[PDB]
Structures are given as structure tokens and as C-alpha cells.
């Protein structure tokens, strides 16, 4: 027989969000027809193929690196993206955007660090990247940071953005941003995003997506810090390493409590790489902190899940 499939033995708290570099916290399910579940990070098939902008480093997510140039008489800088390894980014390559690029619309605040090469002198500054901005054009090779300085950064020198969290306008309706289910225009206004990972949805009666949820840090304002990924990053890493051929439509998983030794709920991990659970309504799952997922068997699509309590 073929290579056995498995998922990591890791508690939810032991794993990482695949869409922002922070730990998972809780499992969340709810209905999803009023939005588009089409995230591009944390997207991998159960047999290890990365889709969208998904990539293996759990820290290089929503980071940017390249050289900056100042925009005259503003406190903003244009960055020319270079690849993860400081190599040139190629925009003709059949991906939506540099791997790791943010896949939601909001203003991400972090720090831009720079090292001057001739002498090893370094500088760092609060900087914010706004992914809705018309200047957010990562697939063209360039994005824009609004910072708190007009003089410090130098041209031609390696600069790095390190994400911290998200902001929203105080006056504007609380929680009105970021919008975790709207993809940016990776090439800017009036262009189609390309090579995207598919949108996903439940396709069985009584079934809803299962989200692995973190809370992004807020830096300023009343932002909506909710962040759902469809696979923990370690799952991506796992499937990529393991490459077990999917035997059937869906991989049945049991979420077990090690303390009582019983199954708490079951769920389907679809081969294209997302999880559905049997439940109607918005629900914050209650799990033991030391519960874990374990693969059970390959079943076909029409397998009926026991309702999740």
C-alpha cells in the first residue's frame, strides 16, 4: 500500500496561524455564504502542493524586503520588492504575488529596519503598509509604506518590514477593518488578480467550514483582530514534507481529548486542503487545551459527520 497520510500531533495552541506570524488560539465555525473564503496563504493540498501565495516559513509571512526610495515631501517610502533570499522578484512567474504577501485588506503596522552596507550602521522606524491602497501593487514589484520619518532611510540599501499587528480609524465604525475576507488588488486598481488558490465552501447539507483562528495584535484604534486560516501553518509544512497521496475525497479526522480519551468531534479534511465540520451557526468551539487531531481514514464526500456538540 501507498504512503499513510497523517496530520501533526499538535494542539491548537502549539501551532501557528498561516496568514500572519502569530500562534493559533481557538477553533471557530460559522456560515460562510455572505463572504468569499479565498485566502492565499496557508493553502496546500493534503498531498503537499502549495497553492496561492503559500510558502513554508512561518515567520516570513506578511513581511517585505527590498530597497526603498523616499516620496518627495511626504513621510512615505516606495519599496521595490526583492525575493525572500534578496534575489530579484520575478513578476512574470505564475503566482498571484510574492509568496507570503498579505492576503487580506487592512493596514498592517510594523517596523522597517535598514542596514547601511558600507559601515554596518542600522536604523529602524515604525511603518505602516495599507493593502487597500492604490500603491499596494506587490505583483508589480512595489508597495508603499507610510512612516514617521522624512530623512532617515537611504537609497540602495537592504530594508526589511516586520509585521506587528493592525490598525483602524477611531472615528470609523469600530471593527470596520481589516477585512480578512477581501483580497487586495495585487496589481493595483483595474487589474485582475491571477493564479489564485480556489475559493472554498461547504458542499454538504448541515456542514460549515472549520476555521483555525488567531487574534492579530491591535496597534491603534478599534480594529477587527479576528483572523481565520484554513490550515495551521504546521499542517502545510507537514503535508509538504510528507506528500502522502490522497486515497479518497476526504480525510476523516477525529479531535480527541487525551484526558478522557474520548473523541470530541469529527471533521473532514478535504483533499484540496480545508476543513468542514457538521454544525449550523456561529460557534467558538470549547476544547481541552491538550486536545489534538488524528487522521482516521479516507472516506468519500458523502460521509455523514456526527453533529459537533
Ligand X SMILES: CC(=O)N[C@H]1[C@H](O[C@H]2[C@@H](O)[C@@H](CO)O[C@@H](O[C@H]3[C@H](O)[C@@H](O)[C@H](O)O[C@@H]3CO)[C@@H]2O)O[C@H](CO)[C@@H](O[C@@H]2O[C@@H](C)[C@@H](O)[C@@H](O)[C@@H]2O)[C@@H]1O[C@@H]1O[C@H](CO)[C@H](O)[C@H](O)[C@H]1O[C@@H]1O[C@@H](C)[C@@H](O)[C@@H](O)[C@@H]1O
Q: Was 279 annotated as part of a binding site?
A: no
- Cell representation of residue 252: 476523516
CB of 123 to ligand X, least distance (A): 3
What's the gap between Cα 162 and its chain centre?
15
Kindly identify the residues of this chain, within the stretch 218-277, that bind ligand X according to CB under 6 A: 220-221
- Alpha-carbon gap, residue 114 to 12, rounded angstroms: 35
Q: Was 207 annotated as part of a binding site?
A: no
Q: Is 237 near its own copies (CB under 8 A)?
A: yes
Q: CB of 139 within 8 A of CB of 187?
A: yes
Cβ-based neighbour number of residue 117 at 10 Å: 11
- Alpha-carbon gap, residue 293 to 93, rounded angstroms: 36
* DSSP secondary structure letter of residue 263: E
Which residue among 69, 78, 80, 113 contacts its own copies (CB under 8 A)? 113
Element (H, E) at 237: helix 233-242
167: nearest Cα among 125, 245, 109? 109
Which residue among 221, 252, 299, 303 contacts its own copies (CB under 8 A)? 221
Which residue among 135, 218, 287, 295 contacts its own copies (CB under 8 A)? 218
Which residue among 122, 260, 282, 304 contacts ligand X (CB under 6 A)? 122
Q: Which residue, 81 or 196, is less far from its own copies as judged by CB?
A: 81
Per CB under 8 A, residues contacting its own copies are 8-10, 13-16, 21-23, 56-60, 84-85, 109-111, 113-115, 119-124, 126, 160, 162, 164-165, 167, 170, 174-175, 217-223, 225, 234, 237, 241, 289
Per CB under 6 A, residues contacting ligand X are 121-123, 152, 169-171, 220-221
Amino acid at each position: 500500500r501507498t504512503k499513510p497520510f497523517t496530520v501533526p500531533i499538535l494542539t491548537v495552541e502549539e501551532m501557528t496561524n498561516s496568514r500572519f506570524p502569530i500562534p493559533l488560539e481557538k477553533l471557530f465555525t460559522g456560515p460562510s455564504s455572505a463572504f468569499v473564503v479565498q485566502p492565499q496563504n496557508g493553502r496546500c493540498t493534503t498531498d503537499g502542493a502549495l497553492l496561492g501565495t503559500t510558502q513554508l516559513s512561518p515567520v516570513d509571512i506578511c513581511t517585505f524586503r527590498g530597497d526603498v526610495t523616499h516620496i518627495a515631501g511626504t513621510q512615505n517610502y516606495t519599496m521595490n520588492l526583492a525575493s525572500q533570499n534578496w534575489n530579484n522578484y520575478d513578476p512574470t512567474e505564475e503566482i498571484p504575488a510574492p509568496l507570503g504577501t498579505p492576503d487580506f485588506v487592512g493596514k498592517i503596522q510594523g517596523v522597517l529596519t535598514q542596514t547601511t552596507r558600507r559601515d554596518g550602521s542600522t536604523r529602524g522606524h515604525k511603518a505602516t503598509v495599507s493593502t487597500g491602497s492604490v500603491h499596494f501593487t506587490p505583483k508589480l514589484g512595489s508597495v508603499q509604506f507610510s512612516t514617521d520619518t522624512s530623512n532617515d532611510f537611504e537609497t540602495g540599501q537592504n530594508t526589511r518590514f516586520t509585521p506587528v499587528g493592525v490598525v483602524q480609524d477611531g472615528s470609523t465604525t469600530h471593527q470596520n477593518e481589516p477585512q480578512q475576507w477581501v483580497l487586495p488588488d495585487y496589481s493595483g486598481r483595474d487589474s485582475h488578480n491571477v493564479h489564485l488558490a480556489p475559493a472554498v465552501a461547504p458542499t454538504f447539507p448541515g456542514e460549515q467550514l472549520l476555521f483555525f483562528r488567531s487574534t492579530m495584535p491591535g496597534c491603534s484604534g478599534y480594529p477587527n483582530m479576528n483572523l481565520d486560516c484554513l490550515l495551521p501553518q504546521e499542517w502545510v509544512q507537514h503535508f509538504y514534507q510528507e506528500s502522502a497521496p490522497a486515497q479518497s475525497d476526504v480525510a476523516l479526522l477525529r479531535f480527541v481529548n487525551p484526558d478522557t480519551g474520548r473523541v470530541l468531534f469529527e471533521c473532514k479534511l478535504h483533499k484540496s486542503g480545508y476543513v468542514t465540520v457538521a454544525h449550523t451557526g456561529q460557534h467558538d468551539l470549547v476544547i481541552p487545551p491538550n486536545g489534538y487531531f488524528r487522521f482516521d481514514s479516507w472516506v468519500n464526500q458523502f460521509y455523514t459527520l456526527a453533529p459537533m456538540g
